[PDB]
Write a protein that binds this ligand. Structure first.
Ligand SMILES: Nc1ncnc2c1ncn2[C@@H]1O[C@H](COP(=O)(O)OP(=O)(O)OP(=O)(O)O)[C@@H](O)[C@H]1O
Ligand SMILES: [Mg+2]
Ligand SMILES: [Mg+2]
Length: 415
């Protein structure tokens, strides 16, 4: 049938699946006439009538977990009509990344430590996104291939939101990734990068990562929780999650930098994006694909980059399973004298400078970024280390700082 699409308390339009299986979307005239109307996606510009392009199917598919296995679980959990996005979202689309609420204001159930552990380990019983069969009003969806869930934090209590109430945190579970990401987010923050705050939460013998959502915002008085429109780069370019990597045809640095020229914060966003490329290289982050970058869609359809997220270093995984440093590749390659430069172990300042030059990113700014990491990295690693718990896995810290300092040496010798 039909899924009515809401942005907070406003009707945006409807998603329908035709008798031919095609996914179509139509904006409500009331939405189109609203003062600050904005599109669901920059790939789905405001217009009247049914939109039938592949961009519709892809946009909504990108709201679901990437893994075909996780999708199998959802189907089995809610006896979904099929595996298509419309049918899976009919079941779990009330709360997803961004502000799209799909249904065919503030209510919740507080969780006890015992119940919290139940949700956080439900995946062991083939439960998708911690949506235990016990509940029936816990419908959430979150993209990405890593096992996770999402919860509502009210004060210092964890809660399962009911109906259309939003979640406030994305909870990532162990597939040592929890400690890895925790460390990387702290290092990012220490270096002045825009990333969300996160904390390691405990529930029995379970250790998960609770990441504060930047697609959610409480009003000043903390009485109402709103969702903020947001989409990832696959969505913004109308592409399927299957091509998130540049090697599979997804957007690279050049395409995203050109797209950011249209940002309401273009110069800042371009600078921050290039800075983050140098950061990913330094920490051996190999999964900076298109779905790991997003933009907020603002009133009137303007857009701006969101904070960076899903930051994992490959360094702690080296050697243990035979992966060598020479095997680490940036998801989005840099310019090389000939072709591209992708090997973290072979990249130097010259590659960032050559890339900036061809992309019209000021050379002075690129030097600034490189020189800033050259003098700040040592102190940043130390400061983070001192901020880590005492039970934090020392091997993670060792693997990351030794490998970061090794690459950092390349910057300090130049700057
Ligand atoms: N703090 C946040 N606030 C808002 N949205 C977020 C936040 N962190 C992640 N997201 C969104 O949720 C998705 C899943 O998170 P994340 O990228 O961290 O997952 P993964 O690490 O599960 O992903 P992958 O599939 O690459 O392994 C992202 O693609 C992004 O759209
Ligand atoms: Mg991701
Ligand atoms: Mg990831």
């Amino acid at each position: 049938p039909k899924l009515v699409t809401w942005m907070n308390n406003q009707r945006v339009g409807e998603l329908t699946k035709l008798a031919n299986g095609a996914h179509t979307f139509k904006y409500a005239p009331e939405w189109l006439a609203s003062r600050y109307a904005r599109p669901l996606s920059l790939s789905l510009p405001l217009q009247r009538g049914n939109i039938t392009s592949d961009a519709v199917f892809n946009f909504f598919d990108n709201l679901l977990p990437d893994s075909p296995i996780v999708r199998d679980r959802i189907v089995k959990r809610y006896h979904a009509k099929s595996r298509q996005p419309f049918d899976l979202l009919s079941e779990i689309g009330r709360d997803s990344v961004g502000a799209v609420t799909l249904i065919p204001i503030m209510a919740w159930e507080k969780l006890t430590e015992a119940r919290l552990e139940e949700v956080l380990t439900a995946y062991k019983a083939d439960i998708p996104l911690g949506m235990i069969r016990e509940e029936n009003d816990f419908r959430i969806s979150v993209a990405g291939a890593q096992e996770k869930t999402a919860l509502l934090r009210i004060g210092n209590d964890w809660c399962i939101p009911k109906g259309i109430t939003p979640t406030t945190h994305i909870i990532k579970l162990p597939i040592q990734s929890v400690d890895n990401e925790y460390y990387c987010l702290l290092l990012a923050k220490e270096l002045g990068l825009n990333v969300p705050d996160a904390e390691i939460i405990k529930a029995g013998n379970v250790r998960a990562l609770a990441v504060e959502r930047f697609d959610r915002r409480w009003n000043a008085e903390r009485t109402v929780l709103l969702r903020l429109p947001q989409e990832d780069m696959c969505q913004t370019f109308g592409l399927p999650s299957s091509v998130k990597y540049e090697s599979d045809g997804g957007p690279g640095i050049a395409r995203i930098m050109a797209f950011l020229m249209g940002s309401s914060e273009a110069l800042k966003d371009r600078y921050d994006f290039m800075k983050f490329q140098v950061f990913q290289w330094l920490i051996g982050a190999t999964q900076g694909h298109a779905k790991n970058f997003s933009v907020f869609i603002q009133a009137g359809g303007s857009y701006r980059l969101t904070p960076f997220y899903d930051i994992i270093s490959a360094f702690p995984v080296l050697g243990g399973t035979g992966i060598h440093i020479s095997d680490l590749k940036l998801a989005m390659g840099l310019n090389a004298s000939k072709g591209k430069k992708t090997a973290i172990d072979k990249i130097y300042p010259r590659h960032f400078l050559a890339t900036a030059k061809v992309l019209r990113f000021p050379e002075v700014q690129m030097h600034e970024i490189l020189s800033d990491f050259a003098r700040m990295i040592p102190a940043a690693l130390d400061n983070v280390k001192t901020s880590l718990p005492t039970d934090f896995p020392e091997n993670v810290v060792t693997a990351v700082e030794s490998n970061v300092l090794r690459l950092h040496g390349r910057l300090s010798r130049e700057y």
